[PDB]
Amino acid sequence: ICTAKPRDIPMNPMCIYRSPEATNRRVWELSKANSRFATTFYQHLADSKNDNDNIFLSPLSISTAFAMTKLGACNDTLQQLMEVFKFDTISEKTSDQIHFFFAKLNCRLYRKANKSSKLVSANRLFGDKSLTFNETYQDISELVYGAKLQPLDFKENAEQSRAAINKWVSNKTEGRITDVIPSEAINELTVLVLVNTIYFKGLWKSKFSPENTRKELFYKADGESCSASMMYQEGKFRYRRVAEGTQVLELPFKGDDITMVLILPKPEKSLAKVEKELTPEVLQEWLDELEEMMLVVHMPRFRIEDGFSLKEQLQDMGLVDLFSPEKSKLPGIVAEGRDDLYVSDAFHKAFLEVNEEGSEAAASTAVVIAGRSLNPNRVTFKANRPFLVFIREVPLNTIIFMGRVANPC
Numbered sequence: 001i002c003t004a005k006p007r008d009i010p011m012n013p014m015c016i017y018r019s020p021e022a023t024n025r026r027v028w029e030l031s032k033a034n035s036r037f038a039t040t041f042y043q044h045l046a047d048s049k050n051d052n053d054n055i056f057l058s059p060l061s062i063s064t065a066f067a068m069t070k071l072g073a074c075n076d077t078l079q080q081l082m083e084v085f086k087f088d089t090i091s092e093k094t095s096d097q098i099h100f101f102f103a104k105l106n107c108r109l110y111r112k113a114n115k116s117s118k119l120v121s122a123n124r125l126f127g128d129k130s131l132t133f134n135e136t137y138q139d140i141s142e143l144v145y146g147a148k149l150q151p152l153d154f155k156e157n158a159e160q161s162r163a164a165i166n167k168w169v170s171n172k173t174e175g176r177i178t179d180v181i182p183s184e185a186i187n188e189l190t191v192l193v194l195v196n197t198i199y200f201k202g203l204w205k206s207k208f209s210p211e212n213t214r215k216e217l218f219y220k221a222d223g224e225s226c227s228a229s230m231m232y233q234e235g236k237f238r239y240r241r242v243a244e245g246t247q248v249l250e251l252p253f254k255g256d257d258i259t260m261v262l263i264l265p266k267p268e269k270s271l272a273k274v275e276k277e278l279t280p281e282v283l284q285e286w287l288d289e290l291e292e293m294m295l296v297v298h299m300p301r302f303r304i305e306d307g308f309s310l311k312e313q314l315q316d317m318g319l320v321d322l323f324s325p326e327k328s329k330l331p332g333i334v335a336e337g338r339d340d341l342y343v344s345d346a347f348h349k350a351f352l353e354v355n356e357e358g359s360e361a362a363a364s365t366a367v368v369i370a371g372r373s374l375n376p377n378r379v380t381f382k383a384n385r386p387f388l389v390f391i392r393e394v395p396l397n398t399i400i401f402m403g404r405v406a407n408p409c
């Protein structure tokens with residue numbers, strides 16, 4: 001329940017970790033944590049992609065999914081989830097309290113009176129049909145994050161539950177996110193699949209007239225060309241031309257609660273060095289340094305889609321135990337304490353759509369317990385002069401989506 005207080009809800013999983021208003025000051029602290037994850041996760045992910053191909057994700061989506069996972073985690077595994085997703089940065093000595101505020105942060109995001117921009121979230125546990133999931137686990141999940149445990153047959157019809165999960169996410173994100181879990185990563189041994197969903201749709205505060213949109217040619221690094229639909233408009237915007245001639249433009253959505261932030265550097269320089277210096281502090285320097293201004297905005301009318309596995313990068317960031325069969329401690333999920341429970345692979349999938357009327361983003365993260373850990377299916381071409389995008393929620397300090405547009409064709 002959103003309407004709640006510290007002691008009221010006894011949200012106590014199996015293992016506690018001790019890291020060496022009040023609620024509002026902690027809800028903010030968790031937002032700080034989320035973005036340090038976002039930033040660092042972004043950086044690691046960028047190394048595994050080219051400089052010229054698109055990148056799109058919801059770092060908040062990922063954070064949430066792994067927080068759901070956390071509830072059944074223990075020992076080393078628990079500790080590492082706290083560190084990697086910067087949840088040990090918050091105040092509370094106890095690690096079962098992180099979830100309290102996470103739910104509260106999720107209450108201010110997905111429930112308001114200010115219904116200008118639609119920003120919805122769904123969570124769902126998909127456990128094996130025959131198994132026995134812990135009673136307390138079940139109700140912490142369902143209470144704190146709203147994740148009901150839908151029984152599915154992983155044992156017999158593995159590949160129909162794989163497509164049932166895909167279809168559930170699919171329904172929850174308006175048709176935009178469908179292929180969350182790559183076809184064959186859930187086998188007979190798969191026990192559980194934890195899923196998160198975020199869906200956004202804003203309308204520009206000051207939209208672009210369709211009349212002024214003109215096709216121009218875009219030239220990819222390859223040495224090829226492609227048409228691109230450029231939009232246009234003049235108006236009063238929060239803008240700034242920061243150090244090294246980098247431009248930071250903010251296009252707010254009806255309401256000013258959620259705004260998009262563009263970031264493009266001077267043509268002679270790359271994005272790479274701006275990418276490499278990105279932190280949650282730097283980003284805030286830029287935002288606080290923004291003044292209003294009459295300016296001409298030329299932004300493409302485009303769509304990008306990005307889907308990948310988080311294993312690699314997450315292991316690089318510090319998530320070692322959770323993915324390993326022998327050391328992964330998750331004994332708070334099933335009946336006795338099946339120690340087997342280890343994560344095979346985790347998948348993310350995002351969609352960004354920008355046009356004259358507004359923007360539409362959507363994403364899904366899924367942690368899969370005990371299936372197959374396949375190699376990722378990623379077919380992308382690379383084109384030039386990319387720009388960073390960020391869809392943020394102002395008041396709550398959270399980065400809903402974030403990405404790099406490098407090809408509007």
Ligand SMILES: *[C@@H]1O[C@H](CO)[C@@H](O[C@@H]2O[C@H](CO)[C@@H](O)[C@H](O)[C@H]2NC(C)=O)[C@H](O)[C@H]1NC(C)=O
Nearest residue numbers: 012013014015134135136137332334335336337
């Ligand atoms: C499900 O997990 C809970 C923890 O959330 C386990 O309950 C603990 O059990 C011991 C002994 O019965 C108590 O001392 C603790 O207070 C209990 N709760 C907590 C929060 O630790 C429970 O054992 C698990 N159930 C099954 C069937 O495994």
Ligand SMILES: *[C@@H]1O[C@H](CO)[C@@H](O[C@@H]2O[C@H](CO)[C@@H](O)[C@H](O)[C@H]2NC(C)=O)[C@H](O)[C@H]1NC(C)=O
Nearest residue numbers: 013014015016017073074075076077078329331
């Ligand atoms: C995994 O972590 C739990 C603690 O979270 C360890 O169990 C505790 O062991 C100490 C003494 O050895 C007891 O005083 C506690 O009551 C135990 N339980 C809990 C819930 O705290 C366990 O030893 C750890 N180690 C391994 C290797 O599993």
Ligand SMILES: *[C@@H]1O[C@H](CO)[C@@H](O)[C@H](O)[C@H]1NC(C)=O
Nearest residue numbers: 167170171172173174175176
């Ligand atoms: C999702 O299912 C609900 C029924 O609970 C339905 O109202 C909605 O239209 C469905 N949406 C999609 C995109 O499938």
